[PDB]
């Protein structure tokens, strides 16, 4: 029996990546298919990434541990740190519940309030706190960590006395990867990386590069003399051959950035551009920046530098040209609000960073990879 | 549409008011955070709740 | 004594801060209720069109 | 007309704010007077300002 990396292996890998984990009870076909190549995949993951993958009877999960965590990676449905704190408290609660045990939502709120380890108390009488817990519960239910049929927490939104009957599912035990030491010894999150890389000392650079490339849409050059980027240059070519054999991607390399493009995204895949209009306006901004390279001098790092004021002028100028075709949502929003949202969005896709203090805008060359415009007949109808 | 525009503008107004109120709340929170930091820190050494 | 002074300041700020937190949450409730109401009404308006 | 309506709403908001502020002002003054009488009571027993 000798399996080979084919369409099926690519599909299993993609399914693993674009989901947090795969549950047997709902994706039995994918689970079996993945299981069939699981042998080749484990070897391959070790060879290229060095990442571990644990496949067991009820689910399969790929510990997509990033080289350096980024904001967009996290559960996006969550909006405050408090949401994560409540999530962790919910986890502790599930640690308190036996498998297939049934508990009421009211009990969960009470124990979470009691246990909550922060100095500043959590109060369930507020609306915002209840919204945070409901979002946490929704994410919990998404992974079937907890099942739910009686009522609907949404009424809990406008009725804190609302009640629902929940059942603790088996998956709660296995949800979180393992932390082999005294977890308290991990006095700070940075110490976790020192673990994952004490486990990846052998050819650490290649595994680092593979993780950085595969996770992020792109990999930005730290500076003119970045050792990592020189490394990338030395094995750009062998990477390209491997990538053509093994995946959907097509490699691109430039002086200050390197990235993977994808040719055919499926339903379940995430890609840029997408439907959200802000990508469109980001592209329009990209074209506008491309059109004045000298005024917005790309610096040696491939970045383009603009101050918040300069950016606001650009956004006004853009609203003048393409604003006619924008959604009424943005057309109706002040310059500064659009500025804040677009800059957060561009951070999520790593196109740029806004220095908090000096307000300098750094636009990465990856932003300059793509530019967009409306069809010409409308551009002339809108603003000729 | 008229009701929608009126409620949207009113909602935007309340958005401003809420933002300023949350600003004030976080200002007070910063003061309180500094005070709690100092109090627990300076009373840290003592074997006292 | 100094820590007691800090304690009085913290308690004062804690009650004011709780007041502000409840006020801000109430305004958030108001804003979100209006926003949900406006969005359902807006879909209703598209449907009606 | 839109601006007139908006500013009327603004007026309702500012009036609410002013009323709440005056409420807190009255409450604070009442508590201040209670504290003042208690202070006077506890100083009256002997020679202090």
Residue with tokens 């600003």: B23
Chain D positions touching B2 (Cβ under 8 A) are none
Residue written as token pair 């080979």: A4
Contact B32 C14 (CB under 8 A): yes
Distance of CA A2 to the CA centre of its chain: 35
C-alpha A201 chain-centroid distance: 26
Q: Please state, as a whole number, how many other Cβ atoms lie within 10 Å of the Cβ of residue A51.
A: 19
A357 CB contacts (<8 Å, ≥6 apart)? none
Q: Do A351 and A364 contact (CB within 8 A), yes or no? A: yes
Give residue A151's region: left, alpha or beta (phi > 0; psi -120 to 50): left
Is the CB of residue A140 less than 8 Å from the CB of residue A79?
Answer: no
Do the beta carbons of residue A104 and residue A146 sit within 8 Å?
Answer: no
Instruction: Determine which of A82, A121, A128 to mutate to test the interface with C (most C C-beta atoms within 10 Å).
Output: A128
Dihedrals phi, psi of A260, to nearest 5 degrees: -105, 130
Query: What is the layout of strands, in order, in the sheet containing A59-62?
Result: A21-23, A59-62, A53-55
CA distance to partner chain C, nearest, from residue A283 (Å): 28
Reported as type and span, the H/E element at residue A267 is none
Q: How far apart are CA C15 and CA C23, in angstroms?
A: 12
Closest residue by Cα to residue A177 from A75, A356, A54 = A54
Residue A166 corresponds to which tokens in the numbers above? Answer: 């929940």
- Residue written as token pair 């603009």: A306
Experimental method: cryo-EM
Tally of residues, chain A: 384
For residues A7-44, one letter each, b for 16 or more C-beta atoms within 10 angstroms of the residue's C-beta and e for the rest, the string is eebebbbbbbeeeebbbeeebeebbebbeebbebbeeb
Q: A374: Cβ–Cβ under 8 A, 6 or more apart, which residues? A: A322, A325, A382
Instruction: Write out the two tokens for A238.
Output: 């062998």
Distance between CA atoms of residues A183 and A161, nearest Å: 37
Quick check: A127 and C22 CB within 8 A? no
Residues A250 and A244: their CA atoms lie apart, in Å, by 7
C39 — contact with chain A (CB < 8 Å)? no
**B6: chain D residues, CB-CB within 8 Å:** 5
D6 vs chain B: nearest CA distance in angstroms? 7
Q: Do B6 and D10 touch (CB under 8 A)?
A: no
**Cβ-based neighbour number of residue A153 at 10 Å:** 19
- Closest approach of C33 to chain B, Cα-based (Å): 10
Query: This structure's resolution (angstroms)?
Result: 6.7
**Do A24 and A58 contact (CB within 8 A), yes or no?**
yes
Please tell me the distance from the alpha carbon of residue B25 to that of residue B12, in angstroms, as a whole number: 20
CA distance linking residue A239 with residue A245, whole number of Å: 10
Residue of A258, A263, A253 lying closest to A213 (CA atoms): A258
How many residue pairs from chains B and D have C-beta atoms closer than 8 A?
9
The chain C residue lying nearest A157, using CA atoms, is C29
- b/e for D35-44, b at 16 or more Cβ within 10 A? eeeeeeeeee
B touches D (3+ CB pairs < 8 Å)?
yes
- Cα separation of A262 and A313, whole Å? 34
Do C41 and B22 make contact, defined as CB atoms within 8 angstroms? no
Q: How far apart, in whole angstroms, are the C-alpha atoms of residue A22 and residue A250?
A: 27
Judge whether A335 and A246 are in contact, CB under 8 Å. Answer: no
């Amino acid at each position: 029996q000798t399996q080979l990396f084919d369409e099926k292996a690519i599909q299993g890998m993609d399914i693993l990546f674009h989901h947090y984990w795969i549950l047997r009870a709902e994706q039995p076909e994918w689970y079996q298919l993945i299981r069939e190549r699981e042998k080749v995949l484990r070897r391959y993951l070790d060879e290229k990434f060095g990442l571990r993958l644990i496949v067991h009877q009820h689910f399969i999960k790929l510990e997509k541990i990033p080289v350096e965590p980024e904001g967009w990676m996290g559960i996006q449905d969550f909006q405050e740190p408090m949401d994560y704190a409540i999530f962790c408290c919910a986890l502790a609660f599930l640690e308190g519940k036996a498998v297939d045990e049934q508990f009421l939502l009211s009990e969960l709120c009470q124990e979470i309030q009691a246990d909550y380890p922060g100095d500043f108390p959590l109060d369930w009488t507020l609306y915002t706190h209840r919204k945070s817990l409901i979002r946490a519960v929704k994410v919990l239910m998404e992974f079937q960590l907890i099942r739910t049929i009686d009522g609907d927490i949404g009424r809990f939104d406008q009725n804190e006395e609302q009640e629902v009957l929940y059942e603790a599912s088996t998956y709660s035990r296995y949800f979180m990867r393992t932390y082999p030491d005294d977890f308290s010894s991990y006095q700070h999150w940075s110490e976790l990386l020192k673990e994952d890389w004490k486990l990846n000392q052998e050819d650490e650079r290649r595994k680092r590069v593979y993780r950085k490339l595969f996770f992020s849409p792109g990999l930005h050059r730290l500076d003119q003399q970045d050792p990592d980027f020189l490394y990338i240059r030395n094995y750009r070519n062998r990477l390209a051959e491997d990538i053509e054999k093994h995946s959907e991607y097509k490699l691109h390399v430039y002086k200050n950035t390197a990235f993977l493009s994808i040719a055919e995204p499926r339903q379940y895949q995430q890609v840029f551009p997408n439907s959200k209009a802000s990508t469109d306006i980001i592209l329009q901004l990209s074209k506008y920046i491309h059109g004045e390279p000298e005024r917005f001098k790309a610096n040696e790092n491939g970045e383009i530098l603009m101050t918040e004021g300069e950016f606001e002028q650009v956004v006004d100028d853009l609203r003048q040209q393409f604003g006619t075709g924008w959604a009424k949502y943005f057309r109706d929003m002040s310059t500064k609000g659009i500025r804040t949202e677009l800059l957060r969005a561009m951070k999520d896709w790593m196109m740029a960073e806004v220095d908090s203090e000096t307000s300098l805008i750094r636009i990465k060359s990856l932003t300059g990879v793509m530019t967009g415009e409306y069809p010409s007949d409308f551009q002339t109808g809108g603003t000729e | 549409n008229v009701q929608i525009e009126k409620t949207g503008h009113q909602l935007e107004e309340q958005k401003k008011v809420l933002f300023q109120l949350d600003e004030q709340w976080k200002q007070v929170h910063g003061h309180l955070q500094v005070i709690k930091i100092q109090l627990h820190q300076e009373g840290r050494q003592l074997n006292l709740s | 004594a100094n820590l007691n002074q800090l304690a009085d300041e913290e308690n004062r700020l804690s009650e004011e801060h709780n007041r502000l937190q409840r006020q801000s949450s109430e305004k958030k409730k108001e804003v979100d209720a209006i926003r949900k109401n406006l969005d359902h009404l807006a879909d209703w308006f598209t449907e009606e069109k």
